[PDB]
């Protein structure tokens, strides 16, 4: 209950950091570990960076400043961006990353359960978004408790953008960062940060069919 927005080791074990080493390695996007080899993030993180050779993924990481050359990392094997996604648009901003080597689940690395197909209409009350967002990049992984807002109520503010049923609204948050909510005593990945007015998140529930098909 102490620490405020600062997170603790193993509190969000599914949180991963996506980084690229071009000249000076830096954190670009967050992601959700959904399996041994699978990471779920936002498609727009790869706009202009399609090559898989430069991406480094860190799991079980809390303090980004502690990352060193010796720190283990996962290399991308396949970047499955949603076919309907377009760089010029924010719709369908969901991407799947396949890691070259399966990760071992530990006290600091665990997958996040995905919502069931029927969970597209359920309402969540205890939701959190975690990331190393900006203010520079915060060293310690941050956590923020944000309430969810209905699509009808959200559209009143983002009048310039069409909020589809495949999106969630709420309102220290990374692009592609997880939006998790505790339901029935189990934490589920409800959304993916897409627009950082309220935050807008890709509704993972609507994309389960795509996720499972690509994953399997």
């Amino acid at each position, epitope marked *: *209950i*102490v620490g405020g927005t600062n997170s603790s*080791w193993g*509190e969000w074990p599914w949180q991963v950091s996506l980084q690229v080493k071009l000249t000076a390695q830096r954190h670009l996007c967050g992601g959700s570990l959904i399996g041994h080899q699978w990471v779920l993030t936002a498609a727009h993180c790869f706009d202009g960076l399609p090559l898989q050779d430069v991406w480094r993924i860190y799991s079980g990481i809390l303090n980004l400043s502690d990352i060193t050359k010796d720190t283990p990392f996962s290399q991308i094997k396949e970047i499955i961006i949603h076919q309907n996604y377009k760089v010029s648009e924010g719709n369908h901003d969901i991407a799947l990353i396949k890691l070259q080597a399966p990760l071992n689940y530990t006290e600091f690395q665990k997958p996040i359960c995905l919502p069931s197909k029927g969970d597209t209409s359920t309402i969540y009350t205890n939701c959190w978004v975690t990331g190393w967002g900006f203010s520079e990049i915060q060293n310690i992984l941050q956590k923020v*408790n944000i309430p969810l807002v209905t699509n009808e109520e959200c559209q009143k503010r983002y009048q310039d953008y069409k909020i589809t049923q495949r999106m969630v609204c709420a309102g220290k948050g990374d692009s592609g960062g997880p939006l998790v909510c505790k339901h029935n005593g189990m934490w589920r990945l409800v959304g993916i940060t897409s627009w950082g007015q309220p935050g807008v998140y890709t509704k993972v529930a609507e994309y389960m069919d795509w996720i499972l098909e690509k994953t399997q």
Partner: antibody
Amino acid sequence: QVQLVQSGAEVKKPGSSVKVSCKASGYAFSSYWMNWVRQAPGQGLEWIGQIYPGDDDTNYNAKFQGRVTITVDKSTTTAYMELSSLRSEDTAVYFCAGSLMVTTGAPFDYWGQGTTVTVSS
Amino acid sequence: DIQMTQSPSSLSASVGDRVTITCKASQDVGIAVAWYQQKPGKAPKFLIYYASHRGWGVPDRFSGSGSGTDFTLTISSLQPEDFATYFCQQYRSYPLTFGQGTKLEIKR
């Protein structure tokens, strides 16, 4: 700031029940597990149970199951522990402790000042 | 229930000394062990979690180590404020359990 303030000391007789309250402030009361721990004068620390106020989910130590009921009042952000069928051995200082993590009940990063409960005829 | 045995029950040391408290779990608790500091009449204070990581604002002199069934708390340079009872807790499995406590006393 983050505070956990418990009720005052209680003196009870055997066979009665005591209700210890823990008023929390300064954080997301509904998102953290509230744990109840008692420290008997000669048996160290003993975890009683925990409640997640958001869903009212509870876990009780099998020792106390059937006698402890942990409940919360979201409106006032207050957690309660109700220990029934009190015995003289229940004399102890009862603490409420907030979990370090939103996602799990242990460990406890902050404790209340404790409530002395004395059970005696 | 997983029993947690701390050693020694009491320990005398001086300001500036390096002191080590050990906690032994009767079962494998991995690294799911936390350490608490309690002074007389006050509430326990959170020091270590996951057996090595310090809590919020805990001085760097407090060091935790160990895994499996054997765990250790080390204070590199005892300050007069460090003299108190120390408890180890395991949260690998429920019910959560604490050690009997190790009291640090001023050597005279």
